[PDB]
Amino acid sequence: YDSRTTIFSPEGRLYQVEYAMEAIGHAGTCLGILANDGVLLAAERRNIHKLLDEVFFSEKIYKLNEDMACSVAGITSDANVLTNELRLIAQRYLLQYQEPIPCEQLVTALCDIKQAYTQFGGKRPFGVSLLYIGWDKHYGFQLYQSDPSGNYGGWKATCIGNNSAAAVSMLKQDYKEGEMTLKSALALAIKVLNKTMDVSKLSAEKVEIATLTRENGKTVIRVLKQKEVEQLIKKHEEEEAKAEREK
Amino acid sequence: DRGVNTFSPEGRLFQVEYAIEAIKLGSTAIGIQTSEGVCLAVEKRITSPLMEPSSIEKIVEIDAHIGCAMSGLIADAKTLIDKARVETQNHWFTYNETMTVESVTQAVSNLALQSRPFGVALLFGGVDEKGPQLFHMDPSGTFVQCDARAIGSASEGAQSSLQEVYHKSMTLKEAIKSSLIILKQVMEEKLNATNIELATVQPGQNFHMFTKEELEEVIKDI
Amino acid sequence: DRAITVFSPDGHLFQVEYAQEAVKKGSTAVGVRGRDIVVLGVEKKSVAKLQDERTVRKICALDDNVCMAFAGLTADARIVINRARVECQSHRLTVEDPVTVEYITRYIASLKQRYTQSNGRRPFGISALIVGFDFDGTPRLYQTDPSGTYHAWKANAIGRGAKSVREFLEKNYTDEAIETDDLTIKLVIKALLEVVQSGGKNIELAVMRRDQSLKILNPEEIEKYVAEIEKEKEENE
Amino acid sequence: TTTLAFKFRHGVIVAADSRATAGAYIASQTVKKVIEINPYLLGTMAGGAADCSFWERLLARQCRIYELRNKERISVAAASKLLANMVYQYKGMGLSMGTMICGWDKRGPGLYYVDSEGNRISGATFSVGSGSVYAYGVMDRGYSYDLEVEQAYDLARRAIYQATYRDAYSGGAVNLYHVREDGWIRVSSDNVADLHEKYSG
Amino acid sequence: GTGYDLSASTFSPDGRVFQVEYAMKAVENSSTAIGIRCKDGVVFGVEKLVLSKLYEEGSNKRLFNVDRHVGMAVAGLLADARSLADIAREEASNFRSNFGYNIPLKHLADRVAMYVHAYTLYSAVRPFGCSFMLGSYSVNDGAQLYMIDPSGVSYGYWGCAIGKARQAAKTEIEKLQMKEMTCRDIVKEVAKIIYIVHDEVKDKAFELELSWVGELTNGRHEIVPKDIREEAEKYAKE
Amino acid sequence: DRKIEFSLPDLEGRTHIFKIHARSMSVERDIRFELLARLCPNSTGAEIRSVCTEAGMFAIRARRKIATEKDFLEAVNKVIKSYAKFSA
Amino acid sequence: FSLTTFSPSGKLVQIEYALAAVAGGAPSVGIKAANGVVLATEKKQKSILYDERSVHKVEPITKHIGLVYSGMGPDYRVLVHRARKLAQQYYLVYQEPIPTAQLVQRVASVMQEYTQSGGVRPFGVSLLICGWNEGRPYLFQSDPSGAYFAWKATAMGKNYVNGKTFLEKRYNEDLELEDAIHTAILTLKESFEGQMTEDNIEVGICNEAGFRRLTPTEVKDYLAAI
Amino acid sequence: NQYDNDVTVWSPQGRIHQIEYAMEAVKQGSATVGLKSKTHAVLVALKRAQSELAAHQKKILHVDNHIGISIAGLTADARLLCNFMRQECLDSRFVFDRPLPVSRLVSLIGSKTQIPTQRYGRRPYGVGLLIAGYDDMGPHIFQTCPSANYFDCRAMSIGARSQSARTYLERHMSEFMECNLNELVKHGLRALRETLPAEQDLTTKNVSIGIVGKDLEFTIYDDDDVSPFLEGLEERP
Amino acid sequence: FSPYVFNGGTILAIAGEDFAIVASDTRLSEGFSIHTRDSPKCYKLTDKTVIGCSGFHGDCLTLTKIIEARLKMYKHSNNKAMTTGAIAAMLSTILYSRRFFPYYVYNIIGGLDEEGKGAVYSFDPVGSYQRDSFKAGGSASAMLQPLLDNQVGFKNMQNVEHVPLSLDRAMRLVKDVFISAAERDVYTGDALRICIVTKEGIREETVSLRKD
């Protein structure tokens, strides 16, 4: 049973919000893995119809600030406005304090706006959940996952896609903190994306990945282009071939 | 029907016949207006000993010469009592005198229904130029002067008992004992000092708490 | 039938009732007085290997003498803390004396009552509870139901398993067992420890020592207090 | 107009004149220039008498509301800050007001001077009005933290007498109040003519 | 029916607004009225049910004076009729304040009809349950008479009727030969037609409210002198 | 014709229903059953029979088949069950 | 409520009905060639009473932005008026950039008042946008609820499925010159029922020089030898 | 019945149903009569009592020295109408220093109450008003129903079982202009006494009288003031 | 253009043992011309309270009518009249409610309190008030006040018994001070309206003064 958004259940559940958050699992696939000296995002390109041109240069990964970037996994209509509002909040903080906005503060502001949307008025909840990777002066590299319920969480290896359970299980099985580096994080991300995507030998076009790294007193958010992605794919394929044949 | 504004097909709009029957879920409260003053007796009905008895209060002094006893949703009674305090202070500030309890009750009744209607009944009691007075205000923005009123879950039985135990020429000393024996008859447990609150109204005194656990001198006689 | 913020044929307020029953989904929360220290714990048991435990924030401070804990919806609770913290800073701006625990609890209850009023606003399905030392020495605990009300309690016991833990507290809420700070802390433990397994490190306790800052007990000291509780349990055959 | 107020170990002494004037003509000489805010707070008129009276009455109702809501008496610093914030939003609109809000609270005797321009500062002693400049000297010379109650009474009476004598806009009667831990008490209302007769020696 | 006659904003499957189709029924149920344009003026006339003798002399009269030279004879729900009369008075006052002189009857009728259409267009507000005639005379424009349905538009009428018995009145109205008869005999004839319409056959005794406007009154729409038109009522009785 | 109704027991009606019900069981009217009649306003005749049934159930629960002089126990069980009926 | 709404668990039912409505019956093909973009549509007026030079299906939003659309034309008029106002406001704010293709992505993004603020009833028109003031062409599609898709060749008519199939089988390709309008007309021919003429077919072209709605003379010239 | 749910919707058979239900609000109320004379207007209202301990409530509200009203029905949105009429009369005093004529005030009330009968979400003012006033044309008695269709009346009564009072007034309305003040008040008392069942009878505590005259400003008489009028009752219950 | 003009007028009130005397001139004038010889500055508000308004005549009229409206509202809202102290406080609130554009008027309220004792409340144009045994307001305030306080108050006089003022003696002193002030102050004269407030009600006497 569902009604106008601002309701409860006889048990006391927000079943509209729960339904929206479960629907977020349906469609879209993004995952974020945090490692030392670099935190990266991996996104699954859903539609690879040959009739596109890929001129927007990014569909899932969005650059929201100099020191952070996000990746939505919900309906694009709310995703666009949420990204615009997030950039506006970050730049408003930059104007007010003359300092890059800490990632936790930005995520709290966004989840506050989502909680307001699901709290008062006859307005639909924002059916979109997005990850965030970023760097700050206080906590360094950080990763956060926010759901449409407005209850964000500070993660270090998570997925938000369709097979998010399988992806997070694969991460948990093959995640090693401390020892993890940027290259090993890339390898793990490509491996888990190959696991969650049924078609083996994933093409560089169907996968979009972005890595945030800390240069000399400056944060560089580089989206890995086709050649680098397929070189990573080739290295992963060599590793798989060696592992399979050595038995 | 279900609309808070639509009238019933027979005689009187609904969703306010529902709001008035919110003292039924509320706790019992009884007040007596005598020539000596006004006696306001309520039950605290503490659910667990860990909760401080001082925290649970159903009688709050609107001003030095007005006392109010709530029966229903304490949350809504807080707003109504705050508005009563604000109106009384505004009247005193404007006219440099003590606002009449009838006028305060009228203002609170005006603010009662103007938002889903408030579901609390108030027993205002205080001294004025027209002697001690007591007023029963009800959730449906209606106030009535009364001499000995009962309100709460068992308002019917308490009011019926008060109808025959009250007489027009009583004093505070008899009023408090009558209210306490009635309360003990209505409630489930006994009238322990930690469970029963009492408020006194005097022409020459401000309305204070009833002796604060030294009021056993009134319950031992009970 | 009808489940909106209107009076039902039998009375009550069914949306408010549903919000009040929503606190059951959440976590336990216990806390006690003692005139020497207020200590409150939550005992969260859900931490995956990939989530950072820093940002759970089940207990938070307001004005370095007032702290609150979660029971129910986390997003609503966080909005409540943000608004309440803003109001504490306002009541520090005006009325230069620091905020009192009763004042901030009253503000939180008033906000909850305001949101329960009118059909537009969802009735803030969170049950908060606030401890802290007032300006005049006396430490106090208030527990706020989601609807509109707050109550000053010696023990709060709000959340899942609230009934059993509250019965345990009211059974043996001995002031002679309160006495010392360590006695107070060990009384909060073995009471919150009773809820669910509480085996390794599930307890998440908090400490407010008079005029000190909000102290979050270190896990090793928590295990030490658990061992002391076990020692007290021993020699009692 | 001339009021002074100082604190000491046995309480707070408030002394004020009872003259309100409109230019050269003296409007009255029996005006209660000290306002009884509540049984534990007192205020004074300086500058615009009507502004002082109205804003102190507004502060009185505000603090009464606060006390009723929180079931506890208001502190002097809180009331002074509230009045200062209340009057600050009207800064630059031309109203003039000088008041020395004083009383006893949980932390002890308190005395804050709130002004229309915005001044709100604590202190051991204060004086406002046209004759405040004359009151300050004789007050400082005769004031100590360990003064007796009668000595403080005499100091305040003599100070207001000198202020009236040296100021053309002050005279009539001297209203003396003593704020104590159990609340303020009205001490005396001495006519300046009788004070001169006594002080002739 | 069912789900289509609930709000005026909901069109019927055939393309009709049933809310106004039901608002017209209230006008059809309420008492009737008649207005005839005489040769040099317009004469009104309405019968009013004295539902109880407890009432004083004719009150809540169906006739209203919306402007100096303009009068309104209304039938239907009388409270909304009075509200609409107040609206018409405000419109006439505003027009006189802005453009000076006196508001032409055609423009006043068009504006009030547009206001009524605005009320029947939306959903939150409901169509007015009243139909009225606006009659006025001037030397320049002669005599005009416009009738407005609860949802329709003003139409020029030589002689019109509305209310309980529209066809029965209109038959004798068309029987009467207007455009050459002075307003005096037109007063007599409107009283005659109203008494021809059934008054006490199944209802109580009826009072005759008759209005005047014309060169015999140099404009200045006023109620006919009832003392001297009681004999017109007597002629109508015969 | 002749539509009539009651189902509105007053104090006198309730206490008379107590008497006829107390005619059954092993009870006697030395109990101050008028006090319990006052306690329950308009408690029908069905509840009075219910209250009398509860009084017998409390007697057998106490294992005492006597109920003539078991008046304090009679009053105790009747008042506590009146509490339960109103709020359980 | 007063916005884009009616989203049940895992669905956007109202949006899906809007997408069923925009299925329409006007193909309105679009092809992004190397030199520019061609937006060609079908004007199959009922009988000969209607006129073809009176109303147009292709509207130049600004100097080099052209627009073609789908079902619910009255909604499309308001949408194109809003797009013109938004592009004009952007050009006034950022004065004199000659903004077409550095604006085509921007104007497509600002097509969020188009649907993200639906207006109780969402718009029932999907529109294709062309711009070439960047040294490169651009073809974008905005649907009744989504956002920019950045197409290279697509159709939005009753036979949009087979139209897109024809576009891909005929190899929209990348080396194709500006005169891919022949392929666009052929794609319309598949979703056309009749002998298409100059007034029956309306097409606008947007090359690096600018945008221009081809007059019936050139439309008939291209339709000749087909 | 669907068409009876809301005020805005119109019944297919004709008049709407919500306003017809609104007129039942005045029907379900204590009886009150009001009659004119040559020079005086008198209102006799039945002060309905909740219980013998509580007072008999308040009826015959006061508006101005020359205008007084009697309410019957929904008392919630009746003090609102009283405030509106008081404000309009005081506005008239403030603008042109003359008592607002009763007819214009009643027209204003009708116009004000007409809008809720057409605006969605606004219930009609289900209050019956018996306005007594003395303008320059002698006394006036007006009845205002929730349908916003006021009436002028020589003598009208509204309330429960008010039809008997209406019949008595109609049968005795011929001898109303030429009656003394006490005679007219006794006529009204007899009319109201005929409303209640035979068990009930007129008492000083359950009746209220409102008299306005040429030289007598509106005055609300009760028990001690009513007793001189209550004498010579000619009691035939 | 300026919204204020001084219209003269002189008011005066005295609080006796059981009576309240409120006297005022009726000469309305500005600049050098006299509008009328009959324009009373006294206004009765209840059976036991009469106010005096002097200064800007338009503001006097507006303030009096606002006071009447507020009294009527309070009587309806409280089922009782308004006490003299209460109307004094209400007038003070009204005056300061328009502090930034004040009524250029001087108000003196004379009447009987609950105790039945004479009460006179003088007012400032911007709201200041204080209870006084007597006060004079208007143009002739400077020339009329000293006489009445040195006679009634026995100021600067020794070996004299402070006898309470009788009604006749107070009336005689009022007439003397007004006839003295009329000739010096051109705004004062042409009549004098004296209102006596007691338990029996309000009694008004109109006496003639210097016609120039």
d(CA C23, CA E50): 65
B95 at the I interface (CB within 8 A)?
Answer: yes
CB–CB contact G9 A2 (8 Å)? yes
Query: Which residues of chain H are within 8 Å of residue E86 when distances are taken between CB atoms?
Result: 111
Residue I13's H or E segment, with its range, is: strand I10-15
B171 at the D interface (CB within 8 A)?
Answer: no
Is C214 in a helix, a strand, or coil?
A: strand
At the fourth CATH level, the homologous superfamily of domain E1-238 is: Aminohydrolase, N-terminal nucleophile (Ntn) domain (3.60.20.10)
Query: Which residues of chain I are within 8 Å of residue D171 when distances are taken between CB atoms?
Result: none
Closest CA to C65 of C211, C217, C219, C235: C211
Residue A114's H or E segment, with its range, is: helix A103-119
- Structural domains counted in chain B: 1
Strand order in the sheet with G29-32: G153-154, G29-32, G36-42, G201-207, G210-213
d(CA C65, CA C69): 14
Is H96 in a helix, a strand, or coil?
A: helix
Sequential DSSP letters for G54-122:
SS-S-EE-SSS-EEE--S-HHHHHHHHHHHHHHHHHHHHHS-SS--SHHHHHHHHHTTTTTTTS--SSP
End-to-end CA distance of chain H: 42
d(CA B176, CA E209): 69
The letter for the amino acid at E105 is L
Query: Which residues of chain E are within 8 Å of residue H111 when distances are taken between CB atoms?
Result: 82-83, 86
Up-side HSE of residue B143: CA atoms within 13 Å toward CB? 23
Q: Are A85 and A106 in contact (CB under 8 A)?
A: no
Is G212 in a helix, a strand, or coil?
A: strand
Is G192 in a helix, a strand, or coil?
A: coil
Token pair, residue H218, equals 């509106």
Phi/psi of residue E84, each to 5°?
A: -65, -35
Query: Given phi > 0 = left and psi -120 to 50 = alpha, else beta, which region is A207?
Result: beta
d(CA B170, CA B179): 12
CB–CB contact I126 D48 (8 Å)? yes
Nearest residue in A to G136, CA atom: A55
Distance set, CA G124 to CA B74, G119, G121, I147 (Å): 51, 12, 9, 91
Torsion of CA B174, B179, B182, B188, to 10 degrees: -140
C10 at the D interface (CB within 8 A)?
Answer: no
> Which residue among H53, H57, H124 sits closest to B149, beta carbon to beta carbon?
H53
Q: Are E22 and H14 in contact (CB under 8 A)?
A: yes
Angle between helices H102-114 and E78-99 (to 10 degrees): 100
User: Choosing among G7, G129, G145, G156, which should be mutated to test the A contact, i.e. which has the most A CBs within 10 A?
Assistant: G7
Q: Are A65 and A106 in contact (CB under 8 A)?
A: yes
Q: A212 to chain G, minimum CA–CA distance in Å?
A: 25
Distance set, CA H41 to CA H141, H155, H175 (Å): 7, 9, 14
* Bridge partners, E214 (sequence order): E41, E219
d(CA C131, CA C152): 9
Token pair, residue A168, equals 């997070």
d(CA B193, CA B184): 12
> Which residue among F41, F86, F87 sits closest to B160, beta carbon to beta carbon?
F41
Strand order in the sheet with I105-112: I42-46, I49-55, I105-112, I118-123, I129-132
Query: Which residues of chain B are within 8 Å of residue C6 when distances are taken between CB atoms?
Result: 2, 4, 15, 18, 116
Is H224 in a helix, a strand, or coil?
A: helix
Question: Which residues form the domain of I112?
Answer: 1-212
**Domains of chain G as residue ranges with CATH:** 1-226 (3.60.20.10)
d(CA A32, CA A211): 10
d(CA B10, CA I198): 57
Q: B37 to chain I, minimum CA–CA distance in Å?
A: 21
Token pair, residue H84, equals 């509106």
CB–CB contact H14 E25 (8 Å)? yes
Residues of H in CB contact (< 8 Å) with E are: 2-3, 7-16, 36, 107, 110-111, 113-115, 117-121, 147-156, 166, 169-170, 173
Torsion of CA C158, C161, C164, C165, to 10 degrees: -50
Is D82 in a helix, a strand, or coil?
A: helix
Q: DSSP 3-state helix, strand, coil percentages of chain I (rounded to 5)? A: 30, 30, 35
- Structural domains counted in chain D: 1
CB–CB contact I100 D94 (8 Å)? yes
Taking residue E50's Cβ as centre, other Cβ atoms within 10 Å add up to 15
Architecture category of domain C1-237 in CATH: 4-Layer Sandwich (3.60)
Question: Which residues form the domain of B17?
Answer: 1-222
Token pair, residue H62, equals 């006061």
d(CA A73, CA E219): 76
Phi/psi of residue G22, each to 5°?
A: -75, -10
Query: Which residues of chain A are within 8 Å of residue G7 when distances are taken between CB atoms?
Result: 20, 124, 127
Residues contacting H69, CB < 8 A, separation 6+:
H60, H61, H63, H82, H85, H129, H130, H131, H132
d(CA I146, CA I173): 12
Distance set, CA A3 to CA A122, C25, E43 (Å): 10, 22, 59
Query: What residue ranges in chain A does DSSP mark as E strands?
Result: 30-35, 38-44, 61-65, 68-72, 130-136, 140-146, 153-155, 157-159, 207-215, 218-224
- Structural domains counted in chain A: 1
Residues contacting C20, CB < 8 A, separation 6+:
A12, C127, C145, C146, C147
Query: What residue ranges in chain B does DSSP mark as E strands?
Result: 29-33, 38-43, 59-63, 66-72, 120-128, 131-138, 142-145, 148-151, 196-201
CB–CB contact I78 B93 (8 Å)? no
The letter for the amino acid at E171 is T
d(CA H18, CA H6): 6
Question: Which residues form the domain of D95?
Answer: 1-201
Distance set, CA B62 to CA B90, C107, E143, I89 (Å): 13, 19, 69, 22
d(CA I30, CA I104): 14
The letter for the amino acid at G151 is W
Q: Are G212 and G178 in contact (CB under 8 A)?
A: no
The letter for the amino acid at G121 is R
**Experimental resolution (Å):** 3.5
User: Choosing among A6, A9, A14, A51, which should be mutated to test the G contact, i.e. which has the most G CBs within 10 A?
Assistant: A51
Q: Are B136 and B146 in contact (CB under 8 A)?
A: yes
Phi/psi of residue C203, each to 5°?
A: -65, 135
H233 at the B interface (CB within 8 A)?
Answer: no
Q: Are strands E142-148 and E155-156 parallel, antiparallel or unpaired?
A: antiparallel
Enumerate the H helices of B59-138 as residue ranges: 74-95, 101-112
> Catalytic positions of D, please?
1
> Which residue among C12, C110, C118 sits closest to B25, beta carbon to beta carbon?
C12
d(CA A131, CA A34): 12
At residue E22's C-alpha, the angle toward residues E16 and E27, to 5°, is 125
Token pair, residue B179, equals 């209210």
Query: C131-147 as b/e, with b when 16 or more CB fall inside 10 Å?
Result: bbbbeeeebbbbbbbbb
Q: Are E215 and E68 in contact (CB under 8 A)?
A: no
Query: Is chain A touching chain D, with at least 3 CB–CB pairs below 8 Å?
Result: no
Residues contacting F37, CB < 8 A, separation 6+:
F11, F14, F15, F18
d(CA C184, CA C155): 12
Q: I11 to chain D, minimum CA–CA distance in Å?
A: 15
Angle between helices A182-196 and A226-245 (to 10 degrees): 80
Query: What residue ranges in chain E does DSSP mark as E strands?
Result: 33-38, 41-49, 63-65, 70-76, 130-138, 142-148, 155-156, 159-162, 206-209, 211-214, 219-223
* Bridge partners, E229 (sequence order): none
d(CA E71, CA E42): 10
Question: Which residues form the domain of A148?
Answer: 1-245
Token pair, residue D151, equals 């000595």
Q: What is the CATH number of the domain that holds D113?
A: 3.60.20.10
CB–CB contact D78 C103 (8 Å)? no
Token pair, residue I130, equals 């204080």
Is residue D22 a known part of a binding site? Answer: no
Is D183 in a helix, a strand, or coil?
A: strand
Query: Which residues of chain C are within 8 Å of residue B24 when distances are taken between CB atoms?
Result: 11
d(CA I39, CA I59): 14
Residue A237's H or E segment, with its range, is: helix A226-245
- Structural domains counted in chain I: 1
Q: How many CB pairs under 8 A join E and H?
A: 103
H75 at the B interface (CB within 8 A)?
Answer: yes
The burial class, CB within 10 Å (0-12 / 13-18 / 19+), for E68 is: middle
- DSSP for residue C53: G
